[PDB]
Structure 1
Amino acid sequence: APAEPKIIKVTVKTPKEKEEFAVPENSSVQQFKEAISKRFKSQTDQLVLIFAGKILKDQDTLIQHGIHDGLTVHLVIK
């Protein structure tokens, strides 16, 4: 059963360092949100990703515009 092994490179810029995560090109944002909160141990609802002038949340889709192929995103709590 294929689940698309197309793992994209998402670089998370946080107020600490710049770590790179690996997620499938067919997953929901909510799934990623809960991943960051567990790995970095910060927040989930207040955890907002940024793609230069654009807010990334569970309203849009990272694999749709945010991360096309190895891009840098920011993390804020506003």
Structure 2
Amino acid sequence: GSSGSSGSPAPVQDPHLIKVTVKTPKDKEDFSVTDTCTIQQLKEEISQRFKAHPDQLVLIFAGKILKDPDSLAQCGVRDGLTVHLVIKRQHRAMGNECPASGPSSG
């Protein structure tokens, strides 16, 4: 069936890099971020994975909406935990037409 271009064994070591599973009413995906990571920081991550502006994405854990200044560890998230996300989908546009250029070698 579905295939995945993968050419690398288990990941290297890390500090407090924990895994967080995002449960959405449309799909679910696992993410990898440090417990110190903030809620707002994750949004910018799930925004591309789910294709939804981080200004709508809503995280829910322990029956309480995670706070920006509340890191994954502050909310109660850990390596192997899940979080039911809910996209408000309050955006009617396709971003902003502009050249997306990146940095050079280095």
TM normalised by structure 2 equals 0.59
Could you tell me how far apart the structure 1 residues matched to 2:32 and 2:87 are? 22
Could you tell me how far apart the structure 2 residues matched to 1:17 and 1:72 are? 13
1:43 is aligned to 53
| CA drift at 1:13 | 0.3
* Unpaired segments ≥5 residues, structure 2: 1-13, 89-106
2:28 is aligned to 18
Question: Which structure 2 residues correspond to residues 1-78 of structure 1 after superposition, within 5 A?
Answer: 5-77=15-87
Asked whether the equivalents of residues 20 and 81 of structure 2 are also in contact (C-alpha less than 8 Å), the reply is yes
Identity of aligned residues (%): 68
- Partner SS state of residue 31, structure 2: strand
Could you tell me how far apart the structure 2 residues matched to 1:65 and 1:30 are? 13
Could you tell me how far apart the structure 2 residues matched to 1:59 and 1:5 are? 20
Higher relative contact order (CA 8 A, sep 6+): 1
- Partner SS state of residue 38, structure 1: helix
1:47-76, Cα deviation, whole Å (9 max, x unpaired): 110013111131422222231231111112
Asked whether the equivalents of residues 56 and 66 of structure 1 are also in contact (C-alpha less than 8 Å), the reply is no
TM normalised by structure 1 equals 0.76
- Greater Rg over alpha carbons, structure: 2
More divergent stretch after superposition (65-74 vs 7-16): 65-74
Asked whether the equivalents of residues 29 and 61 of structure 1 are also in contact (C-alpha less than 8 Å), the reply is yes
